[PDB]
Design a protein around this ligand. Structure first.
Ligand SMILES: [Mg+2]
Ligand SMILES: [Mg+2]
Ligand SMILES: [Mg+2]
Ligand SMILES: [Mg+2]
Ligand SMILES: [Mg+2]
Ligand SMILES: [Mg+2]
Ligand SMILES: [Mg+2]
Ligand SMILES: [Mg+2]
Ligand SMILES: [Mg+2]
Lengths: 129, 88, 218
RNA sequence: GUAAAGCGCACGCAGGCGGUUUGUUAAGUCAGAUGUGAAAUCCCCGGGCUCAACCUGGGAACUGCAUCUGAUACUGGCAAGCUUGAGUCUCGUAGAGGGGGGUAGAAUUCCAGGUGUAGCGGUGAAAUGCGUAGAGAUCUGGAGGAAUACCGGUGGCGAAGGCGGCCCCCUGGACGAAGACUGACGCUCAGGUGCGAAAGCGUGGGGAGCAAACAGGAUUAGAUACCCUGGUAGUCCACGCCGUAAACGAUGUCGACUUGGAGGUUGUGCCCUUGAGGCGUGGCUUCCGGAGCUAACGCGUUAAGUCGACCGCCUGGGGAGUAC
């Protein structure tokens, strides 16, 4: 959005899923693609690309196993006016461990397990189940 | 609103170049005119509120621009407020 | 270039947002049903019928629609199976329990004319009793041979035979319906995007169904 | 939304929040470490009173504050930018947007005069009332005030309240399109300022119709009413005040997403533009309705669906939006 560009990413992804869409598109961003990269390895998204050397536009591909979709849970937490910063011993564990939790570390964007395995903390980004 | 022979006129007096109808120095100054000119209009009628709403608009809108200049080039601010006899 | 050149399109702009990936491309008022997205469905469905027919199962062809009633038996009755070309009763798939009861008085009603047991009671009486056959032998006459719920249901238009399909997905009886632009294929587990109408469309595929089913059981 | 709850509506200071890129900083933040965080409680493991309560060793914890050494993804600061947000310019378009001043035609009432004559008016009936001092009706001339049939629409404009005859003058906003320009200059906004139907208030005007009060007639058991005959404030104007309404979509403003169908109104591109016309592409707006949401009704791309930023508000009924 014009105020919360990251929160929009999640919404556009979840809104697409519900509508059984194929691919979601929206303006890119260092953090955005960075986040989009994680869900990739996590198998939450098929692939992802962008267009524009001056006018970048993210391109994500939704995913679904059977009748229902894959990403059946995606919400934010550390939003503006109410940001969240956890330690290496406070990091959340989405769905008892199954779901992932994106968190920006001094090393870069990671997941609840990722950063933990490292032994460092960062500003939580969102919960993906 | 404003006459072309005036709008397109002033633009060529504050623009740091040519046909720069965007330049704050320009737009901002362009606002004072339609404002000062209307003050003579509002002197009469008075009860005409729906027109003052727009008047106030361009006024605050003008200020929103002045604050910007101060936050982009201190000089340009004090360098323009004089040419327009602003601040009062 | 094959026989599949008769059900190109149907049902004007009324359509149904759901039935889209099967639309060749709207043109001249109504749209078209992408046959290239129909070819797989053309057999994929039949394959299962052919497969299930070998299991000596059951198949009920639903087509209450006039332009399909009289012209449906030859594909079901002749092929010896199950069909309902009339007002689909309420429960002939769920409340079958009590419904079958109606079938009995129908069967025993038949036997009346069978032998001399028809010349019983006033000549008027026979008439009052014979009427029941008209209704019975019609609304059930083509399902009487069903001594238990089927194993798969193949319905023509997915719209008209609405209730029919409903009860099905509530009993676990697979459904092979030839939907259409204004149809709601979400209730069909084996969609066949074709002209729900067209006197020729119905016959060809309908008869084509019994074809695979006929020798389905080898 | 209807249960208690969106301020009547705007503008906007403080405050909160802030599109995209690179460098930089290292404040937030994260990592390590050093202090300190009294002991005792609590907790874990383990000891002694025959057990327990109790007593007790060590640790764990004390989620904090500070300091030092780092890490630089994100937030923040600084520098230089970028253009899609926002804005400026150009040229068009529609409009009951506003303020001022004119002006026209229909009708009412009244004044005068002509014709003409015993009724008119009113109600469910009636009666009050008006009529032989000549009404009513009719026709001619005149005075005056208020509102603008038809077009008028499921229409349009406005922040809200609201805004309809035609003409001129001063003026605001909205939208489209080729574009050109500025370069995050933005969103929200307690307090604050301003706008606010009608009724009402002050001074001075005006006053046709209508009409609280008031007065007759009728109804009725009664009728301080509904009905009828009258009628004052008021309704109208100026200027100042009062700020409320079921000030209602009973639904705060801003932005991004999310199947469809039929229609309205206004801009623009295009099509043998040969046409009423046909195909798109924007603004605003009706009705139906899917997913979803909902306690249900229902809402449903103009959301009451999925989200984000800021603000107002609710916490059982009565007492009470009352007392002080
Ligand atoms: Mg209520
Ligand atoms: Mg309420
Ligand atoms: Mg409101
Ligand atoms: Mg201690
Ligand atoms: Mg930074
Ligand atoms: Mg509006
Ligand atoms: Mg008033
Ligand atoms: Mg007065
Ligand atoms: Mg609806």
């Amino acid at each position: 959005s014009m105020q919360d560009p990251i929160a929009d990413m999640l919404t556009r992804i979840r809104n697409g899923q519900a509508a059984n869409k194929a691919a979601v598109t929206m303006p890119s961003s260092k953090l955005k693609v960075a986040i989009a990269n994680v869900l990739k390895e996590e198998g939450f998204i098929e692939d992802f690309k962008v267009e524009g050397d001056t006018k970048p536009e993210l391109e994500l591909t939704l995913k679904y196993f059977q009748g229902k979709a894959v990403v059946e849970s995606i919400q934010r937490v550390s939003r503006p006016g109410l940001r969240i910063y956890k330690r290496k011993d406070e990091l959340p564990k989405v769905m008892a461990g199954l779901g992932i939790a994106v968190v920006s570390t001094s090393k870069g964007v990671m997941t609840d397990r990722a950063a933990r395995q490292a032994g460092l903390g960062g500003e939580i980004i969102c919960y993906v189940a | 609103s404003l006459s072309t022979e005036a709008t397109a006129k002033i633009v060529s007096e504050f623009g740091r170049d040519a046909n720069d109808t965007g330049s704050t120095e320009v737009q901002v100054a362009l606002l004072t005119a339609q404002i000062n000119h209307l003050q003579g209009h509002f002197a009469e009628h008075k009860k005409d509120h729906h027109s003052r709403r727009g008047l106030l608009r361009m006024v605050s809108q003008r200020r929103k621009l002045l604050d910007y200049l101060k936050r982009k080039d201190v000089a340009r601010y004090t360098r323009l407020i004089e040419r327009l006899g602003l601040r009062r | 270039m094959l026989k599949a050149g008769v059900h190109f399109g149907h049902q004007t702009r009324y359509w149904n947002p759901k039935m889209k990936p099967f639309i060749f491309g709207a043109r001249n008022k109504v749209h078209i049903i992408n046959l290239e997205k129909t070819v797989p469905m053309f057999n994929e469905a039949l394959a299962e019928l052919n497969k299930i027919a070998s299991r000596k199962g059951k198949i009920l062809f639903v087509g209450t629609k006039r332009a399909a009633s009289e012209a449906v038996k030859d594909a079901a009755l002749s092929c010896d199976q199950f069909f309902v070309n009339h007002r689909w009763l309420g429960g002939m798939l769920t409340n079958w329990k009590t419904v079958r009861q109606s079938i009995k008085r129908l069967k025993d009603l038949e036997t009346q004319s069978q032998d001399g047991t028809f010349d019983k009671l006033t000549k008027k009486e026979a008439l009052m009793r014979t009427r029941e056959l008209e209704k019975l032998e019609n609304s059930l006459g083509g399902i009487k041979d069903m001594g238990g719920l089927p194993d798969a249901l193949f319905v023509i238009d997915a719209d008209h035979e609405h209730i029919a399909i409903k009860e099905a997905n509530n009993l676990g009886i697979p459904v092979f319906a030839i939907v259409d632009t204004n149809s709601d294929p979400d209730g069909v587990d084996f969609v066949i995007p074709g002209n729900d109408d067209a006197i020729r469309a119905v016959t060809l595929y309908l008869g084509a169904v019994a074809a695979t089913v006929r020798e389905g059981r080898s």
